[PDB]
A paper describes a structure:
The membrane proximal phosphatase domain (D1) is active, but the distal D2 domain is inactive. PTPRZ (the human ortholog is referred to as PTPRZ1) is strongly expressed in malignant gliomas.
We have newly identified NAZ2329, 3-{[2-ethoxy-5-(trifluoromethyl)benzyl]thio-N-(phenylsulfonyl)thiophene-2-carboxamide, as a cell-permeable inhibitor from other hits found in our previous screening. NAZ2329 showed a more potent inhibition of the first PTP domain (PTPRZ1-D1 fragment) (IC50 of 1.1 µM) than the whole intracellular (D1 + D2) fragment (IC50 of 7.5 µM), indicating that the inhibitory effect of this compound is caused by its binding to the active D1 domain. NAZ2329 was trapped by a newly identified cleft just under the catalytic WPD loop. The catalytic WPD loop with NAZ2329 (left) showed an extraordinarily open conformation compared with that of the apo structure (middle). All these results support an allosteric inhibition mechanism by NAZ2329.
Residue numbers in the entry: 1696 to 1722, 1730 to 1877, 1889 to 1995
């Protein structure tokens, strides 16, 4: 879809509301991928059967984040984690989009952080919301934890009201800093919406990874809806800033080819537009 100059984008959005066109646009975004050369064999192999939080959320073979293989006595495949490399604005493979780890893949998660040279992590969920398990806690409550070969240490936590920042050290104990930005304002009643600190959150995250040679981890629960919502906002604040145009429709359609369901629902989709409208007005 077309590259909307900032100036025109407010009316562009107002239209689609008044128009009501958001629904159709999103149906096109959904049917655009239509499995085209796209497989998920690793995700469905029996060794990996327990590594998938949701059974219908899969990591497509071509973009999936490969782990190094290790030979265990059990013989089972060790190359697998439910996450995919996802492009950014002038930047192939800027993001890793990942499901939130399980108790049983927290070591795999860290080892991914390790092997793919990650320094920053973006967490867009609580462990629990409306009394449903979303994500299992994969960093140490207090001080240090070993996750197999991987030693993680909590060196500080800046708890703000809309979000928390946790700086660890990551070590491989068979012979680095990782900063986690974890948004925490998840309403118990209603659905998400409000701009200022969401943008701030994204702005401070965009800053902290602005120099990071590696990709950044984005993870929610399944690692598709919110994770996607963020990937887009992030990239579009970039493109906005480097060309003063904004291409949500075309950029999302692009990344749906790299991970299933990125930006999961219409509300998120809209959310993105409304939020960006606001971001500008300054
Ligand atoms: C209130 C705090 O909300 C946010 C904070 C930070 C971000 C960020 F990081 F910029 F992406 C985005 C959001 C927006 S998430 C959103 C927006 C409209 S519906 C929705 C959402 O997550 N509905 S869900 O939890 O029902 C859901 C969740 C996942 C899949 C399907 C559905």
């Amino acid at each position: 879809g077309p590259a909307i100059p900032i100036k025109h984008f407010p009316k562009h959005v107002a239209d689609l509301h008044a128009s009501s066109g958001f629904t159709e646009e999103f149906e096109e975004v959904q049917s655009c991928t239509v499995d085209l050369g796209i497989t998920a064999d690793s995700s469905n192999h029996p060794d990996n059967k327990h590594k998938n939080r949701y059974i219908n959320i899969v990591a497509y073979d071509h973009s999936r984040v490969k782990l190094a293989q290790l030979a265990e006595k059990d013989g089972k495949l060790t190359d697998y984690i439910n996450a995919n490399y996802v492009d950014g604005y002038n930047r192939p493979k800027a993001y890793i989009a990942a499901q939130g780890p399980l108790k049983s893949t927290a070591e795999d998660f860290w080892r991914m952080i390790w092997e793919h040279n990650v320094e920053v992590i973006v967490m867009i969920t609580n462990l629990v919301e409306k009394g449903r398990r979303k994500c299992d806690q994969y960093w140490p409550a207090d001080g240090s934890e070993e996750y197999g070969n991987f030693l993680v240490t909590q060196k500080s936590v800046q708890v703000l009201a809309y979000y928390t920042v946790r700086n660890f050290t990551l070590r491989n104990t068979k012979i680095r800093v990782v900063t986690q930005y974890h948004y925490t304002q998840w309403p118990d009643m209603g659905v998400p919406e409000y701009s200022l600190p969401v943008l701030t959150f994204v702005r401070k995250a965009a800053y902290a990874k602005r120099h990071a040679v590696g990709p950044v981890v984005v993870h929610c629960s399944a690692g598709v809806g919110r994770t996607g919502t963020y990937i887009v906002l992030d990239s579009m604040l970039q493109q906005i800033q480097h060309e003063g145009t904004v291409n949500i429709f075309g950029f999302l359609k692009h990344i749906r080819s790299q991970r299933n369901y990125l930006v999961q629902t219409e509300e998120q989709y809209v959310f993105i537009h409304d939020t960006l409208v606001e971001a500008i007005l300054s």
